[model samples]
Target: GAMGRLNQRNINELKIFFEKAKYYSIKLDAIYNEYTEAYNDIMTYSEVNNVTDSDKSKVNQAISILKKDNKIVNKFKELEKIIEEYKPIFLSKLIDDFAIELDQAVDNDVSNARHVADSYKKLRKSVVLAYIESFDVISSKFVDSKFVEASKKFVNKAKEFVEENDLIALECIVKTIGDMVNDREINSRSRYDNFYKKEADFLGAAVELEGAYKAIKQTLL
Candidate 1:
């Protein structure tokens, strides 16, 4: 009779927990979207526009401009690739675990089996941290390696011809480096803490990247 009562308590707890999980999943529907929107908005901003001009020369210029803009857009595609580079192993585990949990939940055969699915969720968070930690190591390596020094040299060469007296030369140095920010391969490994705040989140890197992208857009044309 005592063992029977213990089993009954466990069954009752699961009934309450499953219902709670369903409620949280509903709340997750809204929260998941808030995280995804910034990424989607970036796609909409980068679209091709048709240019119509009566002058043949004007038409050529318009076409050339469009082609150049397209190249820059293609450069930005590397960002997604960088994000995914660390995720091949981790993402598969995450998907497999989530699918299993979802299937069990739907079939009402949960068995209260927390091991597989729970471990996956825990590992997903681990992957995020691993990527962040790797970012730090690579970022410092980049500074030490002086990869951007080449671009700095090029801008300095441009400055020499204009005149050391010109402030524009100094401004060009700052502008040139700023424009070249995204050109340097990002480590994508976060050396910093990611308390999952806006800055530490994936979107946080995107936010800092915005300035580099804006500068490139302004300077290229």
Candidate 2:
């Protein structure tokens, strides 16, 4: 048994922030895992497992998205705002050690606030960088021919991810990837003739890219 929900404004905000922290913490950890596997897929399947494309674009996108004005960056900023502004009285009742540095943060038990700040800083970096990995995996899988093998691998993992997380948001992209994999399997979509139809499939895949991005964006929001 736990305490009653407090009506205080600080209590409400802390609850909200803690909930979001938990949500993001879990998602990021999962996504980070898949992110690692995704790179492995590229290494096994892509042209050369190019580090430049991997690291450079990731850094570029990470910087841009984490920039002050970007909405995604702002999402974490909102949490950081609450963390800094509110120090709930019953700090121990505060669940979730994912933000334990934050607990030490608000409680002012730490010798260096900068180190505490770095906790959020590291979280922000992980969010943006891992997200770039997710975005590029989706983009290349659906749109780039070089990514066909990786695309197949991505779909399988996406299916596993969707089932595990109950994230139907990825279903459409996974479906499209399945179609492409089968098409590539023979060297084919109508299932009538074992023939290649890059035009038909890429058109759908290209468009599904937009759909994929839209749904992915909504989930993050």
Candidate 3:
């Protein structure tokens, strides 16, 4: 049987395509892991504290919250150790897999050169969708519900483009993920309102707690 035939240009293009896709895959994975860690930490704190509105003593609650927060802060600090160690390992595997898969597809002559190019573009489209899915997972917690819905609309349109194999439209969708996030933040009324409320509550509690601690220190003195 004659061997497969794919031109060098097509091969090189596929190689470049996979390389870019791999980079974004790693980027998406890192973002996903960071958000996953934060979500897990939040859940852990809620479970550990069983925090409630009913038990509202300013001084005692502040002391308890501060203590728990300190511990969680320490845990966050420790996270860099594992992230630094694991990221390179994961990236190494990703690169190796990308190379192996591309070489296999090229060798197999799965389709004509043009089809290969189109298929690889479709693969890139899929990778962008994967990134969007990860973004949706994190954005639900990071942004308000209205922003989440807005994001989903973009995501759905992207999916429609993928199904239609509208490469230009797909590229447009991929390029807009960052802008989508930025626009959401810029337009988010809830984000600013909640932030102001939280800051006010924090300053009030923090000042009272500081005085309470000072009084305790004076008693000791």
Candidate 4:
């Protein structure tokens, strides 16, 4: 547990690790707990009820998602590299790799489960890439800007919550993104057009990110 001091780093390093810390914790916990469990629950329900030949693929896909996520069965492999050193993996790649199962009616139930999994696993990645780009904008595009200040505050809040729960750390990242999107002064429109130049794409990703994660919360339970 690298529960080291958050204050040990300067502001630049603080923001750098802040995004990494948030992404790493959220990804680790989500894969193991919520995302993995959702598929498992569907399969468990499907298994107990006995799945159909046509729908076996659904259950198999669920298994594939869990297997591919890697964190579920293996030891923790750190979410990602800090900022620049980071790599972006496409969300669609997950489906390209392994693509789930059931509920009240096994078929319908499986549809619900698979659809939900398909979405957030990728949606979260959309947020991931967008978040990375936005962070870069904050770093190189501007200086002494409100976005920088707000980013620090987000980092601070996430850092404070870091010592708490992994879910809380994720929630901080999600909601903080929402705040950035809706920020009146720097909404990438009206006055500060250049701010968050990737705002259009990031905004769509953030919106979908919210719905996908929220639905995942339900699908998981």
The TM-score leader among the candidates is: 3
Q: Write the per-residue lDDT of candidate 2 for residues 51-167, one digit (tens) a residue.
A: 345533332333232232443334544434333323233222222332444334332222233343344334534333332233343344233243334434443444344333322
RMSD in Å for candidate 2, one decimal? 18.9
For 59-157, candidate 3 gives per-residue lDDT tens digits of 233223323334422332232222332232333343344334333433222232223234333434444455445444433432223434544554555
For model 1, residues 3-39, the per-residue Cα lDDT tens digits are 4454334333323332332322223223223323322
- Model 2 TM-score, 2 decimals: 0.24
Candidate with maximal lDDT: 4
Quantify how close model 1 is to the true structure by its C-alpha RMSD in Å.
26.0
TM-score versus the correct structure, for each prediction: 0.25, 0.24, 0.31, 0.29
The C-alpha stretches of model 2 lying farther than 4 A from their native spots are: 1-98, 106-112, 146-221
Error of 3 at 76 (Å): 31
Query: lDDT for each of the candidates?
Result: 0.33, 0.35, 0.35, 0.42
Worst lDDT run of 10 residues, candidate 3, spans: 181-190
Where in model 3 is the C-alpha error above 4 Å? 1-98, 101-122, 174-221
Between which residue pairs do clashes occur in model 4?
58-100, 101-110, 102-110
**C-alpha-based local distance difference test score of model 1:** 0.33
Kindly state the number of residue pairs that clash in model 2: 1
Query: How close is each model in CA RMSD to the real structure?
Result: 26.0, 18.9, 27.7, 15.8
Prediction-by-prediction clash tally: 5, 1, 0, 3
| Alpha carbon lDDT at 178, candidate 1 | 33
Candidate 4 residue lDDT tens string, 148-182: 44444444444344334334444545554544333
